[PDB]
């Protein structure tokens, strides 16, 4: 196939040749799980992860877009991305990159967080929680939407993982987002809160202290069906 | 359409398989009438077969679906047993991931809520030793599911209580009467109270495991459910 040549071209001195191969890789990465598998079998993951630390903004942006799409694959494909050392550079992009790069790094992390609990554990170990929680306040409304979804996915993990989220100070900004101006943000925030509410009694007590009950009560009379189901479930757990 | 969904459970395409599994799982969580539709569509045998496949992602979703089918009535649990679910569910307790183990324990606990013949099939499939093992090495979240499974098995007949004793359940159950979580104490005290309702030989094994001072500590608990079970078990020990 043509894939080993484009993987080789990711190391080309010619910036036009590097960008062309990177663009070709990105289109394949967005083409579904069978296409992502072809990238994995061509050894594309390791060189792609190395491009996250490149000196060119154009290269970093395309590489993070390709990585985020690979992360939309199945759990075994997320595992290959983790094994390629993607987590540390993705988490790093949250503290030093541009707002455009930050958004794509958050979208990559959210996708990895949709994996199994061991993969969520790898994100926690990579230090993703602190910068994600910081993004719930100190970011644009579009970045907030991606950050709440990443945190909701981490909240879908086991109770020890929910505990790490509480320790990262996620509860107060999440409760504040239950009455955010955007319905899409409320949808993710109520899902994350419903996930945290399914935790242990000590975690339910932390949710109560964060003022979740009056915020969820306001969401009981909501036109959105999923929001209504999540708001009711979290309230049932708070009053069980 | 359920027949096409069932056919898609043996599809080579992993996306088509996972999509059919998610659809099946949603039906399985919708109550007993919905569970009955799955049985009638012949979904249980292909579902159970997915417990052996290479993908942990597929196994996880299949276990989730089975655990929900097991929340059905006893005749529905019976169809799950007839589909060969017990041996692969028990097998997951030894080699699968902690996330898969938690779901397998929930499925087993639901099956154990069935009749005594169903509890007997769980014992014959070898559930007791790995469940007892989970009472001390697993996470607090997995311990809660394991104690609930054991409490259900302990509600069986005296011969089934005997199998729990032989599997070494008394020492860890007694230790769990002083666990930090009240939900853990609730299931631990119900299991002890059930064993206490067994024969005199079984009552003596409870006394030797140090149940009496552990139960005396709980007759002053703020939780009323814990207090009632503790009192019952204590009255059984002093007969």
């Amino acid at each position: 196939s043509e894939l080993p040549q484009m993987v080789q071209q990711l190391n080309s001195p010619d910036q036009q040749e590097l960008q062309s191969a990177l663009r070709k890789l990105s289109q394949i990465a967005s083409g579904g799980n069978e296409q992502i598998q072809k990238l994995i079998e061509a050894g594309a993951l390791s060189p792609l992860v190395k491009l996250l630390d490149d000196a060119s903004e154009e290269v970093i942006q395309e590489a993070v877009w390709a990585i985020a799409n690979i992360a939309s694959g199945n759990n075994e494909q997320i595992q290959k991305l983790i094994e390629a050392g993607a987590l540390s550079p993705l988490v790093k992009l949250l503290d030093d990159a541009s707002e455009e790069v930050i958004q794509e790094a958050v979208w990559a992390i959210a996708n990895i967080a949709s994996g199994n609990n061991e993969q969520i554990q790898k994100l926690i170990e990579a230090g993703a929680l602190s910068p994600l929680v910081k993004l719930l306040d100190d970011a644009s409304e579009e970045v907030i939407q991606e950050a709440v979804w990443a945190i909701a996915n981490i909240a879908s993990g086991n109770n020890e993982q929910i505990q790490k989220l509480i320790e990262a100070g996620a509860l107060s900004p999440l409760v504040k987002l239950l009455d955010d101006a955007s319905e899409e943000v409320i949808q993710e925030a109520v899902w994350a809160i419903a996930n945290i509410a399914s935790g242990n009694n000590e975690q339910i007590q932390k949710l109560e202290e964060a003022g979740a009950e009056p915020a969820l009560e306001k969401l009981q009379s909501s036109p959105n069906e999923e929001v209504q189901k999540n708001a009711q479930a979290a309230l049932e757990a708070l009053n069980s | 359409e359920l027949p096409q969904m069932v056919q898609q459970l043996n599809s080579p395409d992993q996306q088509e398989l996972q999509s059919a599994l998610r659809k099946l799982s949603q039906i399985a969580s919708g109550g007993n009438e919905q569970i009955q539709k799955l049985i009638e569509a012949g979904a249980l045998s292909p579902l159970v077969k997915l417990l052996d496949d290479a993908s942990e992602e597929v196994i996880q979703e299949a276990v989730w679906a089975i655990a929900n089918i097991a929340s059905g009535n006893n005749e529905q649990i019976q169809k799950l047993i007839e589909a060969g679910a017990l041996s692969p569910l028990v097998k997951l307790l030894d080699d699968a991931s902690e996330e898969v183990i938690q779901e397998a324990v929930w499925a087993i606990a639901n099956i154990a809520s069935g009749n005594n013949e169903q509890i007997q099939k769980l014992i014959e499939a070898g559930a007791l030793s790995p469940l007892v093992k989970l009472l001390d090495d697993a996470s607090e979240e997995v311990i809660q599911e394991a104690v609930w499974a054991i409490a259900n098995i302990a509600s069986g007949n005296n011969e089934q209580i005997q199998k729990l004793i032989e599997a070494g359940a008394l020492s860890p159950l007694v230790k769990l009467l002083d666990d930090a979580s009240e939900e853990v104490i609730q299931e631990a005290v119900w299991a002890i109270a059930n064993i206490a309702s067994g024969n005199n030989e079984q009552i003596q094994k409870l006394e030797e495991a140090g149940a009496e001072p552990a139960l005396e500590k709980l007759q002053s608990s703020p939780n009323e459910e814990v207090q009632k079970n503790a009192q019952a078990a204590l009255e059984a020990l002093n007969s």
Binding site: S156, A194 | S71, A109
Partner: peptide, 10 residues
Amino acid sequence: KRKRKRKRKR
């Protein structure tokens, strides 16, 4: 004791 829980994952 029969129990049914909501899936945390979407």
